[PDB]
Amino acid sequence: PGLEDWEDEFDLENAVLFEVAWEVANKVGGIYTVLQTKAKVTGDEWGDNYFLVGPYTEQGVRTQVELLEAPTPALKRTLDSMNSKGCKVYFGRWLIEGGPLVVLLDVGASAWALERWKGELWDTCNIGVPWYDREANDAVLFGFLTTWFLGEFLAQSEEKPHVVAHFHEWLAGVGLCLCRARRLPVATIFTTHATLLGRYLCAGAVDFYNNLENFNVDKEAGERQIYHRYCMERAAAHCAHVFTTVSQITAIEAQHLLKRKPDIVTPNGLNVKKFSAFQNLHAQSKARIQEFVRGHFYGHLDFNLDKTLYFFIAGRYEFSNKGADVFLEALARLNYLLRVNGSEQTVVAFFIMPARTNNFNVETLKGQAVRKQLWDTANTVKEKFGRKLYESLLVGSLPDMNKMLDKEDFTMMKRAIFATQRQSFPPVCTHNMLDDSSDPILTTIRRIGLFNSSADRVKVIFHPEFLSSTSPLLPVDYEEFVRGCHLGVFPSYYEPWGYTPAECTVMGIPSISTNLSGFGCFMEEHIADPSAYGIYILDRRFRSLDDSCSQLTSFLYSFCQQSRRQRIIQRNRTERLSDLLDWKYLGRYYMSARHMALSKAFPEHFTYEPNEADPRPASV
Amino acid sequence: PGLEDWEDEFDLENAVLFEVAWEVANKVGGIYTVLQTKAKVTGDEWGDNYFLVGPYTEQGVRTQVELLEAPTPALKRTLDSMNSKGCKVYFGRWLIEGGPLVVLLDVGASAWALERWKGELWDTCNIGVPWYDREANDAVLFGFLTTWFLGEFLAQSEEKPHVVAHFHEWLAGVGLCLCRARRLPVATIFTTHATLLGRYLCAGAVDFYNNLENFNVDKEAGERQIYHRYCMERAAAHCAHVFTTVSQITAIEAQHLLKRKPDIVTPNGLNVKKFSAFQNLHAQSKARIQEFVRGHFYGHLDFNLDKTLYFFIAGRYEFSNKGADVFLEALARLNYLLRVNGSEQTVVAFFIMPARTNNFNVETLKGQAVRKQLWDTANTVKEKFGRKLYESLLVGSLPDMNKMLDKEDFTMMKRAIFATQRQSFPPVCTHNMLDDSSDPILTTIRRIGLFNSSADRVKVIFHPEFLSSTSPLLPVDYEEFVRGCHLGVFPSYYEPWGYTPAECTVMGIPSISTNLSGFGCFMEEHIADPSAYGIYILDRRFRSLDDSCSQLTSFLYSFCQQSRRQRIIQRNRTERLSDLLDWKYLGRYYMSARHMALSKAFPEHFTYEPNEADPRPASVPPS
Amino acid sequence: PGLEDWEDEFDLENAVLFEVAWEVANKVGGIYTVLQTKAKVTGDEWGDNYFLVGPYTEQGVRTQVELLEAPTPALKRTLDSMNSKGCKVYFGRWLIEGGPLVVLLDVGASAWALERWKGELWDTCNIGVPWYDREANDAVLFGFLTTWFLGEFLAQSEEKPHVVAHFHEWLAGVGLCLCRARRLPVATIFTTHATLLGRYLCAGAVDFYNNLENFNVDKEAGERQIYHRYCMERAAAHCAHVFTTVSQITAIEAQHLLKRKPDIVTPNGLNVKKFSAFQNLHAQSKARIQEFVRGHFYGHLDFNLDKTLYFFIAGRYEFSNKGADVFLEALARLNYLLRVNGSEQTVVAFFIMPARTNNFNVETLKGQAVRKQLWDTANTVKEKFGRKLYESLLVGSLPDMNKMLDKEDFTMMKRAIFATQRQSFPPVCTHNMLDDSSDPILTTIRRIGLFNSSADRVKVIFHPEFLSSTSPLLPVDYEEFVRGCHLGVFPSYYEPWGYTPAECTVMGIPSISTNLSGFGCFMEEHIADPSAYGIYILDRRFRSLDDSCSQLTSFLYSFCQQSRRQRIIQRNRTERLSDLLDWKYLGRYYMSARHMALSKAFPEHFTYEPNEADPRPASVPPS
């Protein structure tokens, strides 16, 4: 279909791309996966003129970096000069699927220059850094080292090429600022994955999205003691040839806080081939989830398990940002609706959000052991009965059904039956809270009245620990457990890009997102009638909290009212949607941004035609 | 072969057997398994005249007891009378493989009688019980209740049968004492599974087995504040028609401390059919143990794993009683011998003894993760290479071997090789000690110098936690792990009967025991040349500590010097040895003891012929 | 969705249904499966008032009939009377999923009445039967026996119920004719599964469907010496309260040859639950078909197997009726188109049509053996390489790729490469023809030029024998092999109802049918834009032969030009189509027909509202 070599045929000639980022070969957050996945297509486009510049860490170097020798004489001269001038620079390959060249700069070996460099910055942009930050100073050192490397690389080159530099956060924006200060012949791009003030303002300050025009960013930046970081990010965004954000909602947020509209929006992608390695995996995972809920709810298995539906929400334990409270309120409302209308449906909701626990509680392990004992006893009696049936049927006689069971069988089954006696109700949490009084999820569960009662049509299971294949009572990793659920609910409030909903959608699982997140906006823009494809977009930007809860309840109830055929058709449509999130399609925006930067910095040699052409027409 | 109905054809007629024990339907220790396993053959012999009398516990009743109603009018009358006289008695069926009838007595519902009953005992045997014991008072209540039940059962019977009562410890000996006091028409048997003073004297007092004739049992019993318990046990043993012990060494110990030679010795048995459900299982378990030691010793896999031998010792964390110190010293000596003689053998020893830990350490999990990563990478590259080879071979061309590996393969293998880098040596313990300074095993390991060095020919792994199938890094239970080891070393010092060595032998694993344990004495008595069958008996009774360590080192070195064929033949001989430990053969001694009791109590109706008749020696004789 | 209890709420009261057919408990053809599958829903609707009347055969009775006694006194009286009057009648259960009551009549025990009954028929309808038919006489005896049974059942009934009789062919039409002759109080239905003259006229006579109005059925019936059978069928159809056919094309054919338009059309259905037990099964079956074509085409595997498509046609070896010649011509045209346009696609077509063979030929077995040898050698070398890689990677060293292969590996691979040498081209037939000169499929293959050449983009494999799981070289049954194919081509010319295309569609496989068959007409009527759902209907009724071949070539080329995503979407739409062919929906037409018969025969007690309501508009293919 639409591949990289579609219409962007550009005269790259002698051009060098430097992918500057603080998080290459050094796992910290989420852009690490972005760069690691994008390296393959970037190297396919640029060949060997692609370098990733990052800080030097011992752990990362010994784990995933293979040190080599500089392949070009100019690079070797640059490395030798910088190493002899009082620095420490390493070169190698990043042991990832693309195998790109990596330049690693040790910021701990250049403290002596800090007192000088900190002055020079002030003599250039009137930006000062407090001595006690301990994280911005690393950014200053990294930026000065990157500018030094770029200048030396341009000086040592026999024929000077057109250099394109791409900085990825405020941690790397000082290098861009200094590149523009020294008037180096480079083309600068700046990408923001989340505006700095956004996460500060979402928590504490009220109505962040309804006061984007009433925010005096100087005041909030200064009062929170992050004024220098805000100035760094805004200066980096201001003096860049091309400015970019990873989502539309981030584009509005940056246009109102960084005072610059992005020239282009480049969404985050991923490699879908590895995820694709969908009904066989779904069936197996659903069977295992059925076994787990059989074990957990032992002694209370009075509801049909062929009419039960498995919802889930996953991610970091952010109660408001991940929208767990809205999910809980909607679950209570859906429980009331299911009880009132006299339905046979049951809904088991899972909350996989890490918290501060110690171990499992006794009830959960007890239930798993009870289920294992019953399964073993049933298999033993079944095998014995099958052998007896075969033997009695080989002689041409109908089995006397009142003698296939004997004394030890009845003993085993009586012990098994005695095992499943319980007077209490299943717990809503599978672990032991260290802060059970101050936990918000459990507090809301208690407030709204979901105690896994027999009359309740909605059961809730809160599983703090991450899902691991070696766990005693969920011996399965995250992906295979998710493949067996029916729906994923991510009603995010503050979310520049949703990695978890995108991963869920790639696996072929219907999902609920919002228009306050990057993934939700992307899917809303690229699909007509997304609900037919299994994506439910919750209008959370133009609605109140109660209206959002009501709409979520409507979505959940309408999902519960589908037939099995409708659910199958919806899940097939969701499955045929993964190619929209691959770097084979989402990597074209990066190409367009680089072309814009090249044409802006060197208009004599390059010219750009603003082709912004880049899908799912169905129903509506 | 030799079954129950071999020569003991006895006129059982109207006889009732009561198997009195404190530990029926109530799991506490090890005789629970003895009674649970023996119930099947006992019920086959006695039919429905077999009752197990024990205390009433809520947990046991709700877990494994099915309450029923009395099947005979006499039993119903007895139960109703006792329940209306101020007691609480339950009747039921024990949910085990035999399914025997159980009479459960609630000792907490008869505290009001204690002040009376405690007096009556003194008016009968001059035995007092201090009020602060809290465990002997339960024994007194249980004994009085059992005597009450037996008396009422005899009173309510229309035709009086011959009752045989079998008491199993000092906790149940008060009932026997009171049965003999009231001159009831019953035949009493007393079985001791361990003499009370033995475990007290083994720890603290020196040379327990070399001073059995120099012990003034009254003094040691009194000084340890267990004089009343000692008097209870000795009185129960004294006034019994038949006295029994579970082993020969226990027989000498009881003859010298209880002042009565046992009339018979009844060893403990087990059901071998369940254990038999052993070369395929051994191969699979050995492969998994190889994988575990590959993971643990990552970055130091410089020794041949086809020449490595897996020893182990298991049981409760008793450093001296289980003989771990002798094992450690012998391991150090064997390490010196293996290094000096320039051998290619390696010995990995396992110490599975529970201790007080919290979690695994980082190194062990790191090694398991490294092994998993290497296995996954190798399988990925292998599958890719196999697909490419098949494709290139279907077109009739030899594979160009320099192009089957491409960039992402080399990336995966380089990452794995980077992962397998380590500068330190593997740990000797897989957990985090809470008392690492005061641990005796680790202290001795440090003292003798076994740090899993590269030059060391003996590696040591101490795994405190019990082996469980759900463990993160040993996902295997005890039986299936043990089935893959080469030898089990149990040089026990004080051990009335060895359940772990017997279980190991039933599975077909060669083992080392001593003549200071019941299992070792049994195997020494029943086998000629036990070492040919894979049982090495250590002479620990007539030797010093250093001589025992030297003999153990000799045994280990001689085992290490066998060829593979010799080891296979030895393990095959060990496999044909499980039927010696089954209740189908070991249940005949109980029958003989019951016959002796019946003939002693009622000589008019029964007479006993002292037939103490009860195949091994060698196979193919080389010399 | 639409179940049986939807809108036909009818007052059955006391009514008895008799499902008369010559083929109950006696497997002959295809209506056996129809009755066996329909019995479940029919019994659910009618309970125990449902009887199947059929001939008595020893094999069927001993295999699938369980003899019982009459459950009602009237039935017992009827059976006793008929058995004492000179007949032989059996009663029992049919051992099928519904378990319906079966009445079996022995036509061989009533030859004495033939000379009488044959006369009586002439005294009623002026129909004579030649003595040498030997199949119509059985029909006459069966019809007279069925009428006798119905009359006796009505005579012996204490309260007379409303009896509904359903006859299913000309073999059972004499009973209906005699029921109407004797004016019995019964409601008759007649179902025709194929008109008798149709199969005679399709072969030999030209342009059968373009001369339906120019056929003097008396002349063709008389000239073919089947005049008596034709008169039997036409008389049965004429004097029936309700007349039915199994398809629309059969409805026109009967309206023009039997001179009576059907009152209703009842299509054949099946139980889809058993077939459903679709991508995992498809993937596995496609892998096995890939392995088979790898074995067959050894030494010529120069084409991409990830771009090959598997077509097939199955059924009885009727060259013209099953439309094999059109398929072959379209295959040749598609081969020319694929070669001219320089495509990378390959098409392997399968012809599974039984013929008269002896055994496999040498080349096919040779290829299977070669493939097995290559697979074994590759697996051996792969396992050895994986073990060496793991061992060399556990020590932290990159594998020296030039030493992972040694002498015996190269020996095995050289032997395999020598084994894969061939100079000739793969055969088009997997067996040894006994009539290779007179075979039409091979003659047409030779004429059109499909010799499995290297340049040919269409390979052809003709496999006469039925697919069996125990075959040496296709060890798989029909269903699993079909599940792996991409398309099924059934361009039938004469086909009253297509069991094979319907079975293929139930499994979820896109198919090509025609409007000259019952299944094709049904799917055309019930679906809007069937090609979006994977059903390609070929206009063969209003087109010539060459136009049909051109349209089939267009269909095949358009299928070959789809992307993988389009093929996946089409196959999903085909999968969501099986519920249209189930008896849960197709059983309602039988209910409507029975209601019409009851209302026509007994208008006083029953009345029928002519409700003929019984739909797949495309999902989202933007139009």
Numbering used by the authors:
A (entry chain A): 13 to 289, 293 to 629, 637 to 642
B (entry chain B), C (entry chain C): 13 to 289, 293 to 629, 637 to 645
What does the study report here?
Glycogen synthase (GYS1) is the central enzyme in muscle glycogen biosynthesis. GYS1 activity is inhibited by phosphorylation of its amino (N) and carboxyl (C) termini, which is relieved by allosteric activation of glucose-6-phosphate (Glc6P). We present cryo-EM structures at 3.0–4.0 Å resolution of phosphorylated human GYS1, in complex with a minimal interacting region of glycogenin, in the inhibited, activated and catalytically competent states. Each GYS1 monomer consisted of two Rossmann domains and a tetramerization domain and interacted with GYG1 in a 1:1 ratio.
We determined a 3.0 Å structure of a phosphorylated GYS1–GYG1ΔCD complex with D2 symmetry applied. The cryo-EM map ranged from 2.9 Å resolution at the core to 3.9 Å resolution at the periphery of the complex, allowing for modelling of residues 13–289, 293–629 and 637–645 of GYS1 and residues 317–349 of GYG1. The complex adopted a rectangular box shape, with residues 317–349 of GYG1 at each corner of the GYS1 homotetramer. In this structure, each GYS1 active site, at the cleft between the two Rossmann domains, was in a closed conformation owing to additional intersubunit contacts at a minor interface (B–D or A–C). The as-purified GYS1 was highly phosphorylated, representative of the T state and supported by the lack of GT activity without Glc6P. In the T state, the N and C termini from each subunit traversed from and toward the two regulatory α24 helices at the dimeric (C–D and A–B) interfaces, respectively. Although there was no clear density for phosphorylation sites 2 (Ser8) and 2a (Ser11), they would be positioned near the regulatory α24 helix of the subunit across the dimeric interface, close to both Arg579 and Arg580, which could potentially sense the phosphorylation at these sites. In both the C1 and D2 symmetry maps, strong density was apparent between Arg588 and Arg591 of both GYS1 subunits at the dimeric interface. We modelled a single phosphorylated site 3a (Ser641), which was the first C-terminal phosphorylation site in the sequence. Overall, our model suggests that the nonsymmetric interactions of a single phosphorylated site (3a) at the dimeric (C–D and A–B) interfaces, combined with intersubunit interactions of phosphorylated sites 2 and 2a across the interface, stabilize GYS1 in the inhibited state.
